[PDB]
Design an enzyme around this catalytic site. Structure first.
Site, PDB file in Angstrom:
ATOM      1  CB  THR A 159      -0.918   0.017   1.182  1.00 31.36           C
ATOM      2  OG1 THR A 159      -1.918  -1.023   1.005  1.00 31.36           O
ATOM      3  CG2 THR A 159      -1.873   1.413   1.100  1.00 31.36           C
ATOM      4  CG  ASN A 180       2.871  -1.248   3.847  1.00 32.52           C
ATOM      5  OD1 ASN A 180       2.613  -0.294   3.180  1.00 32.52           O
ATOM      6  ND2 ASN A 180       1.652  -2.092   3.851  1.00 32.52           N
ATOM      7  CG  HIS A 265      -5.791  -7.803   4.164  1.00 32.22           C
ATOM      8  ND1 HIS A 265      -4.682  -8.325   3.610  1.00 32.22           N
ATOM      9  CD2 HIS A 265      -5.734  -6.429   3.724  1.00 32.22           C
ATOM     10  CE1 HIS A 265      -3.827  -7.585   3.204  1.00 32.22           C
ATOM     11  NE2 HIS A 265      -4.222  -6.469   3.201  1.00 32.22           N
ATOM     12  CG  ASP A 308      -3.583   0.573  -3.044  1.00 33.40           C
ATOM     13  OD1 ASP A 308      -4.313  -0.393  -3.215  1.00 33.40           O
ATOM     14  OD2 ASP A 308      -3.477   1.022  -1.762  1.00 33.40           O
ATOM     15  CG  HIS A 420      -1.912  -6.441  -0.913  1.00 36.41           C
ATOM     16  ND1 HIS A 420      -0.930  -5.466  -0.580  1.00 36.41           N
ATOM     17  CD2 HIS A 420      -2.868  -6.300  -0.021  1.00 36.41           C
ATOM     18  CE1 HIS A 420      -1.443  -4.590   0.599  1.00 36.41           C
ATOM     19  NE2 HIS A 420      -2.430  -5.066   0.684  1.00 36.41           N
ATOM     20  CG  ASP A 683      23.036  -1.360 -12.967  1.00 31.59           C
ATOM     21  OD1 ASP A 683      23.766  -0.484 -12.697  1.00 31.59           O
ATOM     22  OD2 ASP A 683      21.832  -1.340 -12.849  1.00 31.59           O
ATOM     23  CG  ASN A 685      26.080   1.800  -9.929  1.00 37.21           C
ATOM     24  OD1 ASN A 685      25.201   1.155 -10.744  1.00 37.21           O
ATOM     25  ND2 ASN A 685      26.387   2.850  -9.863  1.00 37.21           N
ATOM     26  CG  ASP A 687      22.765   3.203 -10.969  1.00 40.61           C
ATOM     27  OD1 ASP A 687      22.850   2.336 -11.997  1.00 40.61           O
ATOM     28  OD2 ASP A 687      23.457   4.069 -11.093  1.00 40.61           O
ATOM     29  CG  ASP A 691      27.675   0.141 -14.387  1.00 40.15           C
ATOM     30  OD1 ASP A 691      26.673   0.498 -13.658  1.00 40.15           O
ATOM     31  OD2 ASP A 691      28.246  -1.103 -13.991  1.00 40.15           O
TER      32      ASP A 691
HETATM   33  C1  LIG Z   1      13.934   7.600 -11.465  1.00 37.98           C
HETATM   34  O1  LIG Z   1      13.868   8.767 -11.357  1.00 37.98           O
HETATM   35  C2  LIG Z   1      14.824   9.552 -10.507  1.00 37.98           C
HETATM   36  C3  LIG Z   1      14.494  10.861 -10.542  1.00 37.98           C
HETATM   37  O2  LIG Z   1      15.049  11.346 -11.664  1.00 37.98           O
HETATM   38  C4  LIG Z   1      16.188   9.069 -10.681  1.00 37.98           C
HETATM   39  O3  LIG Z   1      17.006   9.346  -9.651  1.00 37.98           O
HETATM   40  C5  LIG Z   1      17.805  10.288  -9.644  1.00 37.98           C
HETATM   41  O4  LIG Z   1      19.019   9.829 -10.130  1.00 37.98           O
HETATM   42  C6  LIG Z   1      20.090  10.576 -10.384  1.00 37.98           C
HETATM   43  C7  LIG Z   1      21.601   9.703 -10.607  1.00 37.98           C
HETATM   44  O5  LIG Z   1      21.485   8.634  -9.854  1.00 37.98           O
HETATM   45  C8  LIG Z   1      20.739  11.439  -9.098  1.00 37.98           C
HETATM   46  O6  LIG Z   1      21.469  12.560  -9.240  1.00 37.98           O
HETATM   47  C9  LIG Z   1      22.363  12.895  -7.937  1.00 37.98           C
HETATM   48  O7  LIG Z   1      21.866  13.627  -7.109  1.00 37.98           O
HETATM   49  C10 LIG Z   1      22.562  13.917  -6.054  1.00 37.98           C
HETATM   50  C11 LIG Z   1      22.000  14.940  -5.014  1.00 37.98           C
HETATM   51  O8  LIG Z   1      20.749  14.362  -4.524  1.00 37.98           O
HETATM   52  C12 LIG Z   1      20.129  15.073  -3.692  1.00 37.98           C
HETATM   53  O9  LIG Z   1      19.254  15.999  -4.090  1.00 37.98           O
HETATM   54  C13 LIG Z   1      18.151  15.855  -4.827  1.00 37.98           C
HETATM   55  C14 LIG Z   1      17.280  17.080  -5.497  1.00 37.98           C
HETATM   56  O10 LIG Z   1      16.233  17.416  -4.723  1.00 37.98           O
HETATM   57  C15 LIG Z   1      17.370  14.787  -4.149  1.00 37.98           C
HETATM   58  O11 LIG Z   1      16.033  14.306  -5.098  1.00 37.98           O
HETATM   59  C16 LIG Z   1      17.939  13.204  -3.858  1.00 37.98           C
HETATM   60  O12 LIG Z   1      17.003  12.472  -3.030  1.00 37.98           O
HETATM   61  C17 LIG Z   1      17.642  11.417  -2.970  1.00 37.98           C
HETATM   62  O13 LIG Z   1      18.503  11.325  -1.425  1.00 37.98           O
HETATM   63  C18 LIG Z   1      17.549  11.433  -0.453  1.00 37.98           C
HETATM   64  C19 LIG Z   1      18.304  11.746   0.930  1.00 37.98           C
HETATM   65  O14 LIG Z   1      19.241  12.681   0.962  1.00 37.98           O
HETATM   66  C20 LIG Z   1      16.333  10.364  -0.398  1.00 37.98           C
HETATM   67  O15 LIG Z   1      15.414  11.008   0.352  1.00 37.98           O
HETATM   68  C21 LIG Z   1      15.765  10.364  -1.670  1.00 37.98           C
HETATM   69  O16 LIG Z   1      14.837   9.103  -1.627  1.00 37.98           O
HETATM   70  C22 LIG Z   1      16.847  10.078  -2.643  1.00 37.98           C
HETATM   71  O17 LIG Z   1      17.331   8.836  -2.556  1.00 37.98           O
HETATM   72  C23 LIG Z   1      17.510   8.124  -3.960  1.00 37.98           C
HETATM   73  O18 LIG Z   1      18.479   8.582  -4.792  1.00 37.98           O
HETATM   74  C24 LIG Z   1      19.772   8.456  -4.162  1.00 37.98           C
HETATM   75  C25 LIG Z   1      20.782   9.324  -4.899  1.00 37.98           C
HETATM   76  O19 LIG Z   1      20.691  10.428  -4.959  1.00 37.98           O
HETATM   77  C26 LIG Z   1      19.918   6.837  -3.814  1.00 37.98           C
HETATM   78  O20 LIG Z   1      21.196   6.829  -3.042  1.00 37.98           O
HETATM   79  C27 LIG Z   1      18.898   6.371  -2.706  1.00 37.98           C
HETATM   80  O21 LIG Z   1      18.909   5.013  -2.608  1.00 37.98           O
HETATM   81  C28 LIG Z   1      17.703   6.737  -3.522  1.00 37.98           C
HETATM   82  O22 LIG Z   1      17.543   5.786  -4.581  1.00 37.98           O
HETATM   83  C29 LIG Z   1      19.115  13.921  -2.721  1.00 37.98           C
HETATM   84  O23 LIG Z   1      18.544  14.653  -1.525  1.00 37.98           O
HETATM   85  C30 LIG Z   1      23.966  14.471  -6.767  1.00 37.98           C
HETATM   86  O24 LIG Z   1      24.815  14.616  -5.258  1.00 37.98           O
HETATM   87  C31 LIG Z   1      24.523  13.421  -7.567  1.00 37.98           C
HETATM   88  O25 LIG Z   1      25.868  14.025  -7.966  1.00 37.98           O
HETATM   89  C32 LIG Z   1      27.109  12.897  -7.708  1.00 37.98           C
HETATM   90  O26 LIG Z   1      27.486  12.236  -8.851  1.00 37.98           O
HETATM   91  C33 LIG Z   1      27.991  13.131 -10.026  1.00 37.98           C
HETATM   92  C34 LIG Z   1      28.312  12.353 -11.285  1.00 37.98           C
HETATM   93  O27 LIG Z   1      28.581  12.943 -12.126  1.00 37.98           O
HETATM   94  C35 LIG Z   1      29.168  14.295  -9.542  1.00 37.98           C
HETATM   95  O28 LIG Z   1      29.156  15.047 -10.572  1.00 37.98           O
HETATM   96  C36 LIG Z   1      29.008  14.813  -8.230  1.00 37.98           C
HETATM   97  O29 LIG Z   1      30.004  15.307  -7.781  1.00 37.98           O
HETATM   98  C37 LIG Z   1      28.267  13.687  -7.220  1.00 37.98           C
HETATM   99  O30 LIG Z   1      29.427  12.892  -6.863  1.00 37.98           O
HETATM  100  C38 LIG Z   1      29.873  13.191  -5.433  1.00 37.98           C
HETATM  101  O31 LIG Z   1      28.902  12.501  -4.450  1.00 37.98           O
HETATM  102  C39 LIG Z   1      29.444  10.848  -4.617  1.00 37.98           C
HETATM  103  C40 LIG Z   1      28.380  10.260  -3.692  1.00 37.98           C
HETATM  104  O32 LIG Z   1      28.451  10.464  -2.245  1.00 37.98           O
HETATM  105  C41 LIG Z   1      30.690  10.690  -4.229  1.00 37.98           C
HETATM  106  O33 LIG Z   1      30.881   9.341  -4.535  1.00 37.98           O
HETATM  107  C42 LIG Z   1      31.445  11.573  -5.314  1.00 37.98           C
HETATM  108  O34 LIG Z   1      32.982  11.276  -5.057  1.00 37.98           O
HETATM  109  C43 LIG Z   1      31.288  13.033  -5.241  1.00 37.98           C
HETATM  110  O35 LIG Z   1      31.863  13.410  -3.843  1.00 37.98           O
HETATM  111  C44 LIG Z   1      23.476  13.271  -8.638  1.00 37.98           C
HETATM  112  O36 LIG Z   1      23.499  14.468  -9.260  1.00 37.98           O
HETATM  113  C45 LIG Z   1      19.105  11.910  -8.376  1.00 37.98           C
HETATM  114  O37 LIG Z   1      19.602  12.243  -6.809  1.00 37.98           O
HETATM  115  C46 LIG Z   1      18.153  10.982  -8.433  1.00 37.98           C
HETATM  116  N1  LIG Z   1      16.830  11.613  -7.862  1.00 37.98           N
HETATM  117  C47 LIG Z   1      16.077  10.930  -7.199  1.00 37.98           C
HETATM  118  C48 LIG Z   1      14.794  11.730  -6.767  1.00 37.98           C
HETATM  119  O38 LIG Z   1      16.171   9.938  -6.668  1.00 37.98           O
HETATM  120  C49 LIG Z   1      16.619   7.644 -10.947  1.00 37.98           C
HETATM  121  O39 LIG Z   1      17.709   7.431 -11.554  1.00 37.98           O
HETATM  122  C50 LIG Z   1      15.332   7.245 -12.001  1.00 37.98           C
HETATM  123  N2  LIG Z   1      15.454   5.476 -12.256  1.00 37.98           N
HETATM  124  C51 LIG Z   1      15.617   4.943 -13.108  1.00 37.98           C
HETATM  125  C52 LIG Z   1      16.282   3.446 -13.296  1.00 37.98           C
HETATM  126  O40 LIG Z   1      15.694   5.329 -14.564  1.00 37.98           O
HETATM  127  C1  LIG Z   2      -1.528   7.575   9.926  1.00 37.80           C
HETATM  128  C2  LIG Z   2      -1.847   8.522   8.814  1.00 37.80           C
HETATM  129  N1  LIG Z   2      -1.159   9.575   8.326  1.00 37.80           N
HETATM  130  O1  LIG Z   2      -1.907  10.157   7.310  1.00 37.80           O
HETATM  131  N2  LIG Z   2      -3.221   9.332   7.209  1.00 37.80           N
HETATM  132  C3  LIG Z   2      -2.926   8.318   7.885  1.00 37.80           C
HETATM  133  C4  LIG Z   2      -3.985   7.385   8.220  1.00 37.80           C
HETATM  134  N3  LIG Z   2      -4.368   6.981   6.637  1.00 37.80           N
HETATM  135  C5  LIG Z   2      -3.690   6.005   6.044  1.00 37.80           C
HETATM  136  O2  LIG Z   2      -3.012   5.295   6.671  1.00 37.80           O
HETATM  137  C6  LIG Z   2      -3.981   5.879   4.604  1.00 37.80           C
HETATM  138  C7  LIG Z   2      -3.380   4.873   4.017  1.00 37.80           C
HETATM  139  C8  LIG Z   2      -1.952   5.183   3.354  1.00 37.80           C
HETATM  140  N4  LIG Z   2      -2.032   6.598   2.480  1.00 37.80           N
HETATM  141  C9  LIG Z   2      -0.858   6.972   1.736  1.00 37.80           C
HETATM  142  C10 LIG Z   2       0.667   6.014   2.382  1.00 37.80           C
HETATM  143  C11 LIG Z   2       1.608   6.567   1.866  1.00 37.80           C
HETATM  144  C12 LIG Z   2       1.959   7.630   0.776  1.00 37.80           C
HETATM  145  C13 LIG Z   2       0.379   8.098   0.296  1.00 37.80           C
HETATM  146  C14 LIG Z   2      -0.738   7.629   0.904  1.00 37.80           C
HETATM  147  C15 LIG Z   2      -1.595   8.492   0.390  1.00 37.80           C
HETATM  148  O3  LIG Z   2      -3.024   8.683   0.357  1.00 37.80           O
HETATM  149  N5  LIG Z   2      -1.411   9.533  -0.587  1.00 37.80           N
HETATM  150  C16 LIG Z   2      -1.851  10.177  -1.654  1.00 37.80           C
HETATM  151  C17 LIG Z   2      -1.804   9.585  -2.989  1.00 37.80           C
HETATM  152  C18 LIG Z   2      -2.848   8.388  -3.244  1.00 37.80           C
HETATM  153  C19 LIG Z   2      -3.005   7.822  -4.626  1.00 37.80           C
HETATM  154  C20 LIG Z   2      -3.421   8.854  -5.636  1.00 37.80           C
HETATM  155  C21 LIG Z   2      -2.002   9.830  -5.755  1.00 37.80           C
HETATM  156  C22 LIG Z   2      -1.936  10.416  -4.065  1.00 37.80           C
HETATM  157  C23 LIG Z   2       0.061   9.070  -0.551  1.00 37.80           C
HETATM  158  O4  LIG Z   2       1.007   9.703  -1.195  1.00 37.80           O
HETATM  159  C24 LIG Z   2      -3.177   7.096   2.651  1.00 37.80           C
HETATM  160  C25 LIG Z   2      -3.484   7.433   4.000  1.00 37.80           C
HETATM  161 CA   LIG Z   3      24.803   1.606 -13.269  1.00 37.64          CA
HETATM  162 ZN   LIG Z   4      -3.765  -4.548   2.322  1.00 36.59          ZN
END
Ligand SMILES: *[C@@H]1O[C@H](CO)[C@@H](O[C@@H]2O[C@H](CO)[C@@H](O[C@@H]3O[C@H](CO[C@H]4O[C@H](CO)[C@@H](O)[C@H](O[C@H]5O[C@H](CO)[C@@H](O)[C@H](O)[C@@H]5O[C@H]5O[C@H](CO)[C@@H](O)[C@H](O)[C@@H]5O)[C@@H]4O)[C@@H](O)[C@H](O[C@H]4O[C@H](CO)[C@@H](O)[C@H](O)[C@@H]4O[C@H]4O[C@H](CO)[C@@H](O)[C@H](O)[C@@H]4O)[C@@H]3O)[C@H](O)[C@H]2NC(C)=O)[C@H](O)[C@H]1NC(C)=O
Ligand SMILES: Cc1nonc1CNC(=O)C1CCN(c2cccc3c2C(=O)N(CC2CCCCC2)C3=O)CC1
Ligand SMILES: [Ca+2]
Ligand SMILES: [Zn+2]
Ligand code: NA
Length: 805
Positions: A159, A180, A265, A308, A420, A683, A685, A687, A691
Site C-alpha cells: 500500500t 510498509n 484481507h 494501489d 498482496h 550495472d 552498482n 542503479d 555504468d
Molecule cells: C527514476 O527517476 C529518479 C528521479 O529522476 C532518478 O533518480 C535520480 O538519479 C540521479 C543519478 O543517480 C541522481 O542525481 C544525483 O543527485 C545527487 C543529489 O541528490 C540530492 O538532491 C536531490 C534533488 O532534490 C534529491 O532528489 C536526492 O534525493 C535522494 O536522497 C535523499 C536523501 O538525501 C532521499 O530522500 C531520496 O529518496 C533520494 O534517494 C534516492 O537517490 C539516491 C541518490 O541520489 C540513492 O542513493 C537512494 O538510494 C535513492 O535511490 C538528494 O537529496 C548528486 O549529489 C549526484 O551527483 C554526484 O554524482 C555526480 C556524477 O557526475 C558528480 O558530478 C557529483 O560530484 C556527485 O558525486 C559526489 O558524491 C558522490 C556520492 O556521495 C561521491 O561518490 C563522489 O566522489 C562525489 O563526492 C547526482 O546528481 C538523483 O538524485 C536521483 N533523484 C532521485 C529523486 O532519486 C532515477 O535514476 C530513475 N531511475 C531509473 C532507473 O531511471
Molecule cells: C497515519 C496516517 N497519516 O496520514 N493518514 C493516515 C491514516 N491513513 C492512512 O494510513 C492511509 C493509507 C496510506 N496512505 C498513503 C500512504 C503513503 C503515501 C500516500 C498515501 C496517500 O494517500 N497518498 C496520496 C496518493 C493517493 C493515490 C493517488 C495519488 C496521491 C500518498 O502519497 C493514505 C492514508
Molecule cells: Ca549503474
Molecule cells: Zn492490504
C-alpha cells in the site's frame, strides 16, 4: 505538546496547517492527537445522517446537522449530496445518459478544470468487470470516460509504496518507501504503520503531486484523511472546498478509501462478503458525482479513479518457514509475508554470511514456494535494489503464499484469507485506472500501463511541470483529449565512425585461430557492398540506436547484421538483425567450432583477444549475432568476427545458445519474422543506469575486456502479423528481456534438465521494457519509424508479461 484550548469555530478542515503547539482543525489533526477541543462537535457533525428526505426539504437551517436540505444550502455549499434529487426534482448523475464532454463547462471564476483523485485500496482490476452489476456509478465513469483493462502497480505490491509511487512518478527504490515496514541503517530508525517515526519527513523522497502543485502556484486540498473521518464527511468536505472563493479554492483534491482492501484481507478477493464493500464504494462515488452535479461541476472536473494494488487468496496454512531451511534462524531478522527481506540480527555478528543463507534457501524442497535472491539479481523490471533500506537478501514469494521465520510467528502476535505484495506482473495484483472529464477521452479504452506514468499526466492535467521522475512523459498522451505533452527525441551525443579496411591480418596477435583460408569479381563486389551497408535496410529497420553519452564507437556492416562497436568496452553496444519467417537455422560446421576471426576494420588495440578467454578458467565467450542464423555458409564467417564476440559464463551460454538456436526462429515463425537487437549491459552498482568504465567490477582475467552484468534483447515485429517484420506499414509489437549474466543457473531449480524445460521460463521472469534497456545502456531506440513519437514512447514502455487473461 498541544494546547487543545483554541477553537475550530469557522476553521473546520482548514487548509494551512497551524503550527505547534496551537490546536489544529485540518483533516489530519486526529492522527496527530492535536485537534482543538471542539473539533468533533463543530467539524464532525452527524445529526440526521447524510441524505435529504422529503420532509427536510425546505427545512429551516439547523447548524447541528451533518448536511443540509434548507433552501440556503446551495449558496452555503453544504447541501446533502442528494439534495437536488430529493427536493428539486433532479436526477442522480448515474441515471443521466453519457454525453461527451468536448469542452470544460465550468462556472465563472474557475481558471482550469479541477482534478479529483479518488483512490481505492486493494481494488483488484478484475473487480471492474466482476462487480460491474453492483457498481453502477463506477461503471458509468469507466464506460463513458477513458479506462485501462488494468493498471500495473510497482513492486512490492504493498500500500505505502504504491500510493507514494502514484504521487511521485518514482520507483520505491527512489522515493524511499520501499515497504510498509523499513529499517534505515543510516538513520538507525525503523518505519512502521503503527507509530510516529512514519511522520518524519526524512523517509519521504521525491516530490509528491501536492508539493509540485504548491511550488508552482496551484493550490492543493490536503490529501490525507484521519481514518475515523467517515467517507461521507470526506466527500462533503471536498465539495465545501470547491465552493470556496476563487483565490482560496484548491484545484487538486484527493479522496482515499481503505476499502475494499480492508475486507479483502479478511474474506479473500472474491469472498461473498466482498459485494457490500464494492456497493459502498460505488455509493460514495455517486455522492461525489451528484455533489459535483449540484455545483455545476460534473462537466468541469477531471476525476481519476485509481487503485494501489490488487488482492490474492492467501491463508495461514500456505506459509513457508525459514526454520525448516536454516540452522541459524535466530541470527537473522526477516521482514515477512508476501515478500521476504533478510538481514543480520546484530551487526556485531562476525559469523554472518549471506552466501550460506542464500544457499540454504536455494532449491531445497521440490514444491518450494519462494526463491531467494541477492537484490542485484532480482529481475530488473522490478527496479528494487538501489536503496539502503532494501536488504541485500530478498525472497520472491509465490502467489498465494507467505514466508515467515518460525511457526510461532503465525499464531503468536486462520483469520486472513487475502493478501498482496507479490511480483507486480501477477494478475491478482493488478489494479484499476479510469479517467473521466473534459481533458480525458470519451468512451476510450487504452492498453494496460504502469502506475509510475500517472504523475506526469496529473501534472499535465493541472498545467504543472513534473519533477524528475520514472515516467516516460508522453507515453500516456493517448489517454488525453488535450493538454498533451509533445516531447522531442533526445539529441544523439556521439556520432559513429564508419571504418573501412585498415589492417592486415598479420598485425593482429590475438591468439585466435580460424579455418577460413579458402576462397570472383561477381560476389567479391557483392561482399564489398555488404560491408558498406547494402543490406542495412533489411537488418536495421528502425534506424540506428542513438548513443546518448560521450564515447567512441564504430558502425560495422555485414550481410546478416549491423553493429555499433564500442572501442571503450571492446564489444558491441548493440547488434541488429532481422530473421524472416522463412529463415533456416543451421549448425556450426565442425571445422568452425572454435573459429574466431580478426576484424580488419578495427585495430588490434581495440579488439578482444582469444588468449584471455583461454587463460580465464571461469569465462568463455558467445556471439551477439548467432552463427546458427547465417544466411549462407560464406556469410557465416562474419558471425565469428572478434567484433561480434562477448564474454559469457559457460552456465550462461546454455541459456544464450538455446535463445539463439531455438527461440529466435520460434519467434520469427510465430510473429512473421522478427527484428532482434541484442547487447551487453553493465550495472555493477545496480542503479538501473548504464555504468561508466570506472564502475566496472570485473574483467576477463588479465585483460581490459569488461564483463557484462546482463545481456538484453529487443524483439520487434509488425503488430498486424499478416505483414512481415521487414515490411510493416503500421504499429509495432515488441517483447524484450534483460537476462542476468550469472556463472550458475541456481536461479533455475530445473536447470539440470534440457534447456527446453527451463530457459524460456527464466527469460519470461526477466522480461523488460525497451525503456529499461535504454536506462541501462544510454541508447535511444526506434529513431526512424513512420510512427508518431508518442506511440513510440508507449511502445518503449510496453512490458510483455506472459500472464493469462
Ligand atoms: C527514476 O527517476 C529518479 C528521479 O529522476 C532518478 O533518480 C535520480 O538519479 C540521479 C543519478 O543517480 C541522481 O542525481 C544525483 O543527485 C545527487 C543529489 O541528490 C540530492 O538532491 C536531490 C534533488 O532534490 C534529491 O532528489 C536526492 O534525493 C535522494 O536522497 C535523499 C536523501 O538525501 C532521499 O530522500 C531520496 O529518496 C533520494 O534517494 C534516492 O537517490 C539516491 C541518490 O541520489 C540513492 O542513493 C537512494 O538510494 C535513492 O535511490 C538528494 O537529496 C548528486 O549529489 C549526484 O551527483 C554526484 O554524482 C555526480 C556524477 O557526475 C558528480 O558530478 C557529483 O560530484 C556527485 O558525486 C559526489 O558524491 C558522490 C556520492 O556521495 C561521491 O561518490 C563522489 O566522489 C562525489 O563526492 C547526482 O546528481 C538523483 O538524485 C536521483 N533523484 C532521485 C529523486 O532519486 C532515477 O535514476 C530513475 N531511475 C531509473 C532507473 O531511471
Ligand atoms: C497515519 C496516517 N497519516 O496520514 N493518514 C493516515 C491514516 N491513513 C492512512 O494510513 C492511509 C493509507 C496510506 N496512505 C498513503 C500512504 C503513503 C503515501 C500516500 C498515501 C496517500 O494517500 N497518498 C496520496 C496518493 C493517493 C493515490 C493517488 C495519488 C496521491 C500518498 O502519497 C493514505 C492514508
Ligand atoms: Ca549503474
Ligand atoms: Zn492490504
Ligand atoms: Na539450477
Amino acid at each position: 505538546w498541544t494546547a487543545t484550548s483554541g477553537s475550530c469555530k469557522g476553521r473546520c478542515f482548514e487548509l494551512q496547517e497551524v503550527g505547534p503547539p496551537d490546536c489544529r482543525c485540518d483533516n489530519l489533526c486526529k492522527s496527530y492527537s492535536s485537534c482543538c477541543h471542539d473539533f468533533d462537535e463543530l467539524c464532525l457533525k452527524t445529526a440526521r445522517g447524510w441524505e435529504c428526505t422529503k420532509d427536510r426539504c425546505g427545512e429551516v437551517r439547523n447548524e447541528e446537522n451533518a448536511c443540509h436540505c434548507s433552501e440556503d444550502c446551495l449558496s452555503r455549499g453544504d447541501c446533502c449530496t442528494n439534495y437536488q434529487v430529493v427536493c428539486k426534482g433532479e436526477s442522480h448523475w448515474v441515471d443521466d445518459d453519457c454525453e461527451e464532454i468536448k469542452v470544460p463547462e465550468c462556472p465563472a471564476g474557475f481558471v482550469r478544470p479541477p482534478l479529483i483523485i479518488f483512490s481505492v485500496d486493494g481494488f483488484r482490476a478484475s473487480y471492474m468487470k466482476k462487480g460491474s452489476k453492483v457498481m453502477p456509478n463506477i461503471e458509468k465513469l469507466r464506460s463513458c470516460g477513458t479506462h485501462a483493462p488494468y493498471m500495473r502497480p510497482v513492486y512490492p505490491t504493498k500500500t505505502f509504496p504504491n500510493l507514494y509511487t502514484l504521487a511521485t512518478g518514482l520507483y520505491p527504490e527512489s522515493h524511499g518507501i520501499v515497504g510498509n515496514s523499513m529499517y534505515d541503517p543510516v538513520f538507525d530508525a525503523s518505519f512502521h504503520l503503527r507509530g510516529r517515526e512514519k511522520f518524519n519527513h526524512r523517509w519521504w523522497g521525491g516530490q509528491p503531486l501536492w508539493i509540485t502543485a504548491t511550488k508552482q502556484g496551484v493550490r492543493a486540498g490536503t490529501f490525507f484523511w484521519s481514518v475515523s473521518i467517515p467517507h461521507e464527511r470526506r466527500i462533503l468536505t471536498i465539495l465545501q472546498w470547491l465552493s470556496l472563493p476563487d483565490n482560496e479554492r484548491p484545484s487538486v483534491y484527493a479522496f482515499y478509501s481503505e476499502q475494499p482492501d480492508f475486507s479483502g484481507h479478511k474474506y479473500g478477493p472474491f469472498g461473498p462478503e466482498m459485494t457490500n464493500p464494492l456497493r459502498e464504494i460505488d455509493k460514495t462515488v455517486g455522492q461525489l458525482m451528484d455533489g459535483l452535479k449540484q455545483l455545476r461541476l460534473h462537466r468541469c472536473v477531471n476525476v481519476i479513479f485509481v487503485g494501489d494494488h490488487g488482492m490474492e487468496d492467501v491463508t495461514c496454512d500456505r506459509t513457508e518457514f525459514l526454520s525448516n531451511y536454516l540452522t541459524n534462524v535466530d541470527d537473522i531478522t526477516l521482514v515477512p509475508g508476501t515478500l521476504g527481506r533478510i538481514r543480520a540480527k546484530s551487526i556485531n555478528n562476525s559469523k554472518y554470511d549471506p552466501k550460506t543463507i542464500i544457499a540454504a534457501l536455494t532449491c531445497k524442497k521440490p514444491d518450494q514456494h519462494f526463491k531467494p535472491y541477492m537484490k542485484q539479481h532480482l529481475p530488473k523490471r522490478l527496479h528494487y535494489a538501489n536503496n539502503r533500506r532494501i536488504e541485500d537478501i530478498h525472497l520472491l514469494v509465490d502467489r498465494r503464499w507467505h514466508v515467515a521465520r518460525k511457526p510461532l510467528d503465525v499464531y503468536k502476535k486462520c483469520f486472513f484469507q487475502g493478501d498482496h505484495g507479490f511480483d507486480n506482473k501477477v494478475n491478482s495484483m493488478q489494479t484499476v485506472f479510469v479517467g473521466y472529464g473534459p481533458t480525458f477521452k470519451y468512451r476510450t479504452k487504452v492498453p494496460p500501463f504502469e502506475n509510475i506514468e500517472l504523475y506526469n499526466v496529473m501534472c499535465d492535467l493541472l498545467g504543472l511541470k513534473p519533477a524528475p521522475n520514472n515516467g516516460t512523459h508522453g507515453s500516456l498522451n493517448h489517454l488525453l483529449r488535450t493538454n498533451t505533452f509533445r516531447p522531442t527525441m533526445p539529441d544523439e551525443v556521439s556520432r559513429p565512425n564508419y571504418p573501412g579496411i585498415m589492417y592486415l591480418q598479420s598485425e593482429f596477435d590475438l591468439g585466435c585461430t580460424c579455418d577460413d583460408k579458402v576462397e570472383n569479381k561477381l560476389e567479391e563486389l557483392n561482399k564489398r557492398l555488404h560491408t558498406k551497408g547494402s543490406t542495412k535496410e533489411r537488418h536495421l529497420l528502425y534506424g540506428r540506436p542513438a548513443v546518448l553519452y560521450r564515447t567512441s564507437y564504430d558502425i560495422l556492416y555485414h550481410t546478416d547484421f549491423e553493429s555499433g562497436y564500442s572501442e571503450i568496452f571492446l564489444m558491441p553496444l548493440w547488434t541488429s538483425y532481422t530473421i524472416s519467417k522463412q529463415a533456416e537455422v543451421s549448425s556450426i560446421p565442425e571445422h568452425l567450432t572454435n573459429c574466431v576471426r580478426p576484424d580488419v576494420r578495427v585495430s588490434p588495440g581495440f579488439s578482444q583477444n582469444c588468449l584471455a578467454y583461454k587463460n580465464d578458467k571461469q569465462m568463455s565467450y558467445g556471439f551477439l549475432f548467432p552463427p546458427y542464423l547465417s544466411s549462407s555458409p560464406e556469410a557465416k564467417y562474419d558471425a565469428f568476427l572478434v567484433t561480434n564476440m562477448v564474454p559469457m559464463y559457460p552456465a550462461f551460454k546454455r541459456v544464450w545458445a538455446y535463445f539463439q538456436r531455438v527461440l529466435v526462429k520460434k519467434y520469427a515463425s510465430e510473429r512473421n519474422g522478427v527484428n532482434v537487437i541484442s547487447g551487453p549491459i553493465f550495472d555493477y552498482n545496480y542503479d538501473g543506469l548504464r555504468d561508466t568504465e570506472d564502475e566496472i567490477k570485473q574483467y576477463v582475467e588479465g585483460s581490459s575486456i569488461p564483463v557484462p552484468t546482463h545481456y538484453y534483447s529487443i524483439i520487434t515485429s509488425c503488430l498486424d502479423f499478416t505483414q512481415p517484420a521487414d515490411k510493416c506499414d503500421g504499429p509495432l509489437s515488441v517483447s524484450s528481456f534483460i537476462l542476468p549474466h550469472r556463472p550458475d543457473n541456481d536461479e533455475s531449480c530445473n536447470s539440470s534438465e534440457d534447456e527446453s524445460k527451463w530457459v524460456e521460463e527464466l527469460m519470461k521472469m526477466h522480461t523488460a521494457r525497451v525503456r529499461d534497456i535504454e536506462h541501462l545502456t544510454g541508447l535511444d531506440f526506434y529513431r526512424k519509424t513512420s510512427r508518431s513519437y508518442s506511440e513510440i514512447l508507449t511502445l518503449k514502455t510496453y512490458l510483455h508479461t506472459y500472464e493469462s487473461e
